[PDB]
Amino acid sequence: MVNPTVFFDIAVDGEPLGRVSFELFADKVPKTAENFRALSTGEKGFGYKGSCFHRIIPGFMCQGGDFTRHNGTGGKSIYGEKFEDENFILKHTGPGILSMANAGPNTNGSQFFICTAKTEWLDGKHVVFGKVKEGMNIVEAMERFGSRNGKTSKKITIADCGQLE
Amino acid sequence: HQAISPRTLNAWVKVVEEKAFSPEVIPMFSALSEGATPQDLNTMLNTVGGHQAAMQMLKETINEEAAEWDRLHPVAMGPIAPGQMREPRGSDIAGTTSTLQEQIGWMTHNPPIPVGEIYKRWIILGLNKIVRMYS
């Protein structure tokens, strides 16, 4: 297939919660899809395995991918530098959309979010690059560990991750 | 919310016409800008005709302070939580890339980011620069 599929095995304070898989839209945002795919496999020698969902806002999104500082201030792409907003073709149309977190235009690194609602106001501000395939119910469960300001009530970890096929 | 008054502005013009860029402009500027938004501050500054070189010294200080602000206040990773506002950047505090309810929010939040008071401090430093040059 053109579009890779990636999996996260989510844990909550060390205990297994369940698997979420994603379709990555390489056919629309190949650079941003490849970044997330490679970080998911560990093939560059660093990546998502062991990292946490540091910011979870119920009724909005779950954010993760900061595998360098674990608190939202870090993360790095496979490109050796932050990279540009590839396009804003795809929209934030509902639960399960997978999109790039950023700190301004053209500052993509490794942080991402998983929408748990329609967040249309994000269109043109965050690059949409995939969607949850299996395990939406796990994302919904993860949401219960969040708060209004995003602080989580337990450690929500990517205990394992990789590419399916 | 009410934007700065014509009468307040008349008094500030009167101050600036007579008193040079003497030290006395600084305390007047502070009294007349009590509770100003950044828009109000720009409106008071805009009233100043001429004094172009001085106005440029002030702008340079504003520009310098805005960039320092930015350095000491890096932007959090978004996406912004719903029901919230972007933290302000230097440009937003100086009113150049922000709008008025954009400015008023900050000034009301819990706790507040008093964008008017911060921009006022910058202006004050620029007025001190002006006063040391000319007087």
Automatic annotation (TrEMBL), chain B:
GO terms for biological process: viral budding via host ESCRT complex; viral translational frameshifting. Belongs to the primate lentivirus group gag polyprotein family. One of its GO terms (cellular component) is virion membrane. The keyword Cell membrane does not apply. It is found in: Host cell membrane; Host endosome, Host multivesicular body; Virion membrane; Virion. Its main location: host cell. This is Gag polyprotein. The keyword Transport does not apply. GO terms for molecular function: RNA binding; structural molecule activity; zinc ion binding. The lineage of its organism: Viruses, Riboviria, Pararnavirae, Artverviricota, Revtraviricetes. Keywords: Capsid protein, Host cell membrane, Host cytoplasm, Host endosome, Host membrane, Host nucleus, Host-virus interaction, Lipoprotein, Membrane, Metal-binding, Myristate, Phosphoprotein, Repeat, RNA-binding, Viral budding, Viral budding via the host ESCRT complexes, Viral nucleoprotein, Viral release from host cell, Virion, Zinc, Zinc-finger.
